[PDB]
Amino acid sequence: GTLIRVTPEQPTHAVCVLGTLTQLDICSSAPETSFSINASPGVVVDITWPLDPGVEVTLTMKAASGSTGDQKVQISYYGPKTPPVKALLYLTAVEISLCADITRTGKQRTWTWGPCGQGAILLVNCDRDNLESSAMDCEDDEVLDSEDLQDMSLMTLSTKTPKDFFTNHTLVLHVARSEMDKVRVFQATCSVVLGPKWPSHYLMVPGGKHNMDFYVEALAFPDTDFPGLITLTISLLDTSNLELPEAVVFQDSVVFRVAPWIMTPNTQPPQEVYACSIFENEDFLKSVTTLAMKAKCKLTICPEEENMDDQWMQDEMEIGYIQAPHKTLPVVFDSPRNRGLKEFPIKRVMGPDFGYVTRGPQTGGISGLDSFGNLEVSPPVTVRGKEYPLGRILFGDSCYPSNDSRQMHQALQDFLSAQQVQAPVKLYSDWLSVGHVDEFLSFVPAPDRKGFRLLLASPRSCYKLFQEQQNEGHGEALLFEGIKKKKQQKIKNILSNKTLREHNSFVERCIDWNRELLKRELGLAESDIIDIPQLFKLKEFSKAEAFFPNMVNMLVLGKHLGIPKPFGPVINGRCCLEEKVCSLLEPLGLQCTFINDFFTYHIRHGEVHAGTNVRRKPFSFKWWNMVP
Amino acid sequence: GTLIRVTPEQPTHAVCVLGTLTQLDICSSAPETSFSINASPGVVVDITWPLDPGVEVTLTMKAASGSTGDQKVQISYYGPKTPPVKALLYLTAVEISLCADITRTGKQRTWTWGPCGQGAILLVNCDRDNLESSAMDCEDDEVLDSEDLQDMSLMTLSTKTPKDFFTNHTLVLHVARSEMDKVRVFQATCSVVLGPKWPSHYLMVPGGKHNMDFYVEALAFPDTDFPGLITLTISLLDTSNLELPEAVVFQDSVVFRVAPWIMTPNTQPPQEVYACSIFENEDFLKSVTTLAMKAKCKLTICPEEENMDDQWMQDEMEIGYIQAPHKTLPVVFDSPRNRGLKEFPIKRVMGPDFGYVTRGPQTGGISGLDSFGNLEVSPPVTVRGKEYPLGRILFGDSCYPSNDSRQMHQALQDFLSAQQVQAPVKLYSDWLSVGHVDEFLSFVPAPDRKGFRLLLASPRSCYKLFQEQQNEGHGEALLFEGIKKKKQQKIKNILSNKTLREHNSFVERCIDWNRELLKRELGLAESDIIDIPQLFKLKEFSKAEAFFPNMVNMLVLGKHLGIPKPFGPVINGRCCLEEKVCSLLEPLGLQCTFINDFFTYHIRHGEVHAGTNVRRKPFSFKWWNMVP
Numbered sequence A, B: 001g002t003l004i005r006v007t008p009e010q011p012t013h014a015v016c017v018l019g020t021l022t023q024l025d026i027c028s029s030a031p032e033t034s035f036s037i038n039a040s041p042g043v044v045v046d047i048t049w050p051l052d053p054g055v056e057v058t059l060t061m062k063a064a065s066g067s068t069g070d071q072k073v074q075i076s077y078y079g080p081k082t083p084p085v086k087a088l089l090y091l092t093a094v095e096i097s098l099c100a101d102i103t104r105t106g107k108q109r110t111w112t113w114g115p116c117g118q119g120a121i122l123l124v125n126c127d128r129d130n131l132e133s134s135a136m137d138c139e140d141d142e143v144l145d146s147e148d149l150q151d152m153s154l155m156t157l158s159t160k161t162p163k164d165f166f167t168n169h170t171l172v173l174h175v176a177r178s179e180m181d182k183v184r185v186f187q188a189t190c191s192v193v194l195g196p197k198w199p200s201h202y203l204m205v206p207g208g209k210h211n212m213d214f215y216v217e218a219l220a221f222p223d224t225d226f227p228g229l230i231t232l233t234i235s236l237l238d239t240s241n242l243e244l245p246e247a248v249v250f251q252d253s254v255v256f257r258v259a260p261w262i263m264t265p266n267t268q269p270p271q272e273v274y275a276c277s278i279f280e281n282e283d284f285l286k287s288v289t290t291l292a293m294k295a296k297c298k299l300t301i302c303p304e305e306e307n308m309d310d311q312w313m314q315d316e317m318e319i320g321y322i323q324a325p326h327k328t329l330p331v332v333f334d335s336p337r338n339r340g341l342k343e344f345p346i347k348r349v350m351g352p353d354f355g356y357v358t359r360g361p362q363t364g365g366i367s368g369l370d371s372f373g374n375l376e377v378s379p380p381v382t383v384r385g386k387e388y389p390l391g392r393i394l395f396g397d398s399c400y401p402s403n404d405s406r407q408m409h410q411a412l413q414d415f416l417s418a419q420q421v422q423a424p425v426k427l428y429s430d431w432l433s434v435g436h437v438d439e440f441l442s443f444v445p446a447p448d449r450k451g452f453r454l455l456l457a458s459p460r461s462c463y464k465l466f467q468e469q470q471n472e473g474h475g476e477a478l479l480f481e482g483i484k485k486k487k488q489q490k491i492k493n494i495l496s497n498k499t500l501r502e503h504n505s506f507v508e509r510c511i512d513w514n515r516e517l518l519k520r521e522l523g524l525a526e527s528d529i530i531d532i533p534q535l536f537k538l539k540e541f542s543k544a545e546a547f548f549p550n551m552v553n554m555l556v557l558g559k560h561l562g563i564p565k566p567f568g569p570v571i572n573g574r575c576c577l578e579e580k581v582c583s584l585l586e587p588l589g590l591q592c593t594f595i596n597d598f599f600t601y602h603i604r605h606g607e608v609h610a611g612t613n614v615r616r617k618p619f620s621f622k623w624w625n626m627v628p
């Protein structure tokens, strides 16, 4: 919008950027009725006319100018007995278009979500394409490798002006100071024009037709203090007068949205398995190695030299991804728990086309709920109309905060919620000694009704199974058959044990609370849910541990399942727990491999899921097409 | 939602909170077909029935229970040739309702905006009702005065239970740890149950019918790191088993929204005028004193003993308000500029039913754009459909950030935007030496087309006026007539002055940029806008100052206007500037008093608006009925 004031006293000189609304004030500075307008061929004057202020005269120009003032507008004032007084207006048209990929195909100043929304995407440049380095590429102010540009967003400036236009005009590129610390912009022919302490740069542009490519990288993920929008603006400045400041003539912008960190549920096909089972054990690895190969996955393992005897590969990290039309890459969220595996995500996982992020305090003030066995996601789900096409992050909390209760650190919770595309759901996991959601739930694929089953651990299902076994005359059958060093226990004594039943009654209560919570927040019905027979016992501070290997804490590699070997009562040549789990999951097309983890993982309060991790394929559905 | 599991083996015992969905799992633990249900009179079993899992059995209860298990449900399993096995379920119904004023009249766990939305309002307790104090009432953890409770939000807990119910159940009140630092909650019979380091409290409730009143105060305004929602939850805990942890049976919540700080435009009726013109001047006060009395306003003045010779009462503070169904009060936003007036808002303005807030760094790192002459609001306005019924905060910035450019501090900008009900608009004010939007705009009431006029300073209007004057033969007339000590200047030399014209041409450019910006962001047309004749000159660093008293920098007390006396060219016994301004505003019903501010304010780079401040009446329209 621009209102150009015209006068008979003086010719006015003005610039018209193509695609802008130009109007004329004819009345204000007229002499003394009536007026007529006549313009050169390249000027459409939409609108023999009375000189009253309320009449809108609008000038639009068809093409850019070859020279200054090469279009003209002549306003003739006349009336009763007065010969015409003409006022002159010399116009210079230019094209100034700041362009980005706002339709999100690989190629308004507001960013909108959804399949009909507009707005370019920007990735946080949190990987490390630089040959022999330790820092994320976005930590410095240089493009060090040509392949690094693939991670960045292209923005072009298209100018069509007279050859001499920038003698008296100049173009400046800027970002608000409130956002300069979150973006960096390079000019290509690479060198920095904008960034953390350069919020504006004067561009050197020649007259005529020119195109100027910029590459943009983001420096921060969306968070509590950053909704995730970055605006870059080009201003056109009139510097015609050596005795006056610059005068802005035109501004235009692009709004980028920074891509959120996104998790992958168990129903996304696996690509790489992680285990760091180089330590005292060896046959554990054999079995996961087999499943990886069965599942067609790369296999990376972390040796004891690196582990520091930390076997819990599930817990230090979570592999998600970031996604833009031009580029998708895996990104590792590094938990603050910082045990033996501390270095593993930064040294081994971060790298070429593998991003990195972390949150929370790095030197204390952490609980067990910050380890990422307590961090999962559901499969795609619609909940009473609202679609969650990338599912919903699930993490474990207490039911209310007390002196003795634990939570995942607020900084981690705030980061997950700020990603706003897997709208997190808080579940109750603090009744567990360890305290992770993966101790009572898993998800598995299925070929029908929604494409998955929620598995929950179920003391009810194990009592039912053992009771049926006793009814059929197998009361003498032994839990922990096949184990060299353990108090073996008969089904009959397990059932008569009134304290065990009390404990598993309370655990059942905790699990059922989550059941219903998941039914509500994921829109599940009973037919989405399979109960896995599972016993627990309360121990220190009345917190729950697994009575036998926690089968629900399994590795899900498509149809290939890595379930901890319950060393269950052997009936008709076969553990009846294995049997029961096989009768539950085999009809969905799942292959159950039971893995001996007993003296390696189980005796230390976790199982196969706890000792592994999986990088999975990112959703084909593009996060920006969601309406959170 | 609750799924109660029933068994023939054992009677189950369960609690049903009225208004909840209770279902029965009949199938899982049945013996072996068919089943029938029979319940005591107070239990409606909506649903001779086949024993397949997919059949929903739902129990609802009509009233609270007089004793434990006083309602019963009997599920009979039968079939081919088997005499009935009955399973027992003893129910105890209770009422547990956490109530607040969610319809917003003075009396879902999601807060929604608008006339059909739900959610109680909570005020930040930022005033000082305490007799002889210096702190805001919410700085400590006590209610010190009964009148302080008027500022707080009532929340009641209504329980109807058996006399013996809390022998084996307990109720806990809690707030998330992420929000405990922003709220405080008192229990009334006052003492703290929740707050900054007490996120949960066990309530002492007797059986039978009980009602427990709580009072709630907020401790922080919405900001970058606080959307403004506070959730309080009541949990019901089963503590029946001395050898097991508490088990949550039911949670319920209320979501409060903290009330935003809201500004009042010039079109809101004035109530109190501020001047701190106790210093070298005296006749300035006489004139503002007169207008206040004309306008029916309280008048408070800050003496030189307090001023520290700071006359700029506009600049240290902005008086807005906060509003809830139960309570509305004025609140002062104290600018970080911290000159002589520093103490005035904390000592004189904060008090009984007068809130306080401040932002930004208190000891440096401030610019002139942080003084609140650069902080205004427009009148109510609709913009291409979108209604802004409390108008839009307007504040001054540069057009782009450079080494030499100024801005209002980001913390101030972030606070204003987080109030989200007067969606701020950034204007261009940095071309001014001082740099405040009140140097080029004001708003005044009007009885037609929208209810106001935007006034802009206008060099074009003054040149037009002076030229018409010269045409009629008054070229010799003297700007600055009546002034003892100043270079007097003839209209003719003012007009022939080519540098003055250049300067005012550039100023006109800066003002016109804002014109159009305001047209776009406020939905204004030309007929909403009056130009006030006004000349400027560029000085140090090419920054604009007023050539004569800046008439637009006026005090607006309804129809009574306090305009700085331009000491303009006297024609036909009257300054022609005064005359022109009077011809512009008198037809709207405005009374123009021209005030001598010349050697007191004007010579120090401000005028009547700069030397005063106004507390105005809050909008009758309630902010929560908006849809930002």
Ligand SMILES: N=C(N)NCCC/C(NC(=O)c1ccccc1)=C(/N)O
Pocket: A312, A314, A315, A368, A371, A372, A373, A374, A434, A436, A438, A439, A553, A603, A604, A605, A606, A607, A609, A610, A611
């Ligand atoms: N469910 C999981 N994803 N992980 C469970 C990991 C269990 C693991 N256990 C232990 O680290 C442990 C147990 C006994 C002695 C020494 C250490 C913790 N607490 O982190």
Ligand SMILES: N=C(N)NCCC/C(NC(=O)c1ccccc1)=C(/N)O
Pocket: B312, B314, B315, B368, B371, B372, B373, B374, B434, B436, B438, B439, B553, B603, B604, B605, B606, B607, B609, B610, B611
């Ligand atoms: N337009 C306003 N609301 N306020 C203008 C106040 C002008 C005021 N001027 C001055 O403080 C000043 C001028 C000359 C010598 C010493 C001090 C500033 N800069 O704050």
Ligand SMILES: [Ca+2]
Pocket: A137, A138, A139, A140, A141, A142, A143, A144
């Ligand atoms: Ca780099």
Ligand SMILES: [Ca+2]
Pocket: A125, A126, A127, A128, A129, A137, A147, A148, A151
């Ligand atoms: Ca890179």
Ligand SMILES: [Ca+2]
Pocket: A316, A334, A335, A336, A337, A338, A342
């Ligand atoms: Ca770590």
Ligand SMILES: [Ca+2]
Pocket: A127, A129, A147, A148, A150, A151, A352, A353, A354
């Ligand atoms: Ca890369």
Ligand SMILES: [Ca+2]
Pocket: A314, A318, A372, A373, A374, A375, A376
């Ligand atoms: Ca995990």
Ligand SMILES: [Ca+2]
Pocket: B137, B138, B139, B140, B141, B142, B143, B144
């Ligand atoms: Ca108090």
Ligand SMILES: [Ca+2]
Pocket: B125, B126, B127, B128, B129, B137, B147, B148, B151
């Ligand atoms: Ca109070």
Ligand SMILES: [Ca+2]
Pocket: B316, B334, B335, B336, B337, B338, B342
């Ligand atoms: Ca202050």
Ligand SMILES: [Ca+2]
Pocket: B127, B129, B147, B148, B150, B151, B352, B353, B354
């Ligand atoms: Ca009060």
Ligand SMILES: [Ca+2]
Pocket: B314, B318, B372, B373, B374, B375, B376
């Ligand atoms: Ca103000």
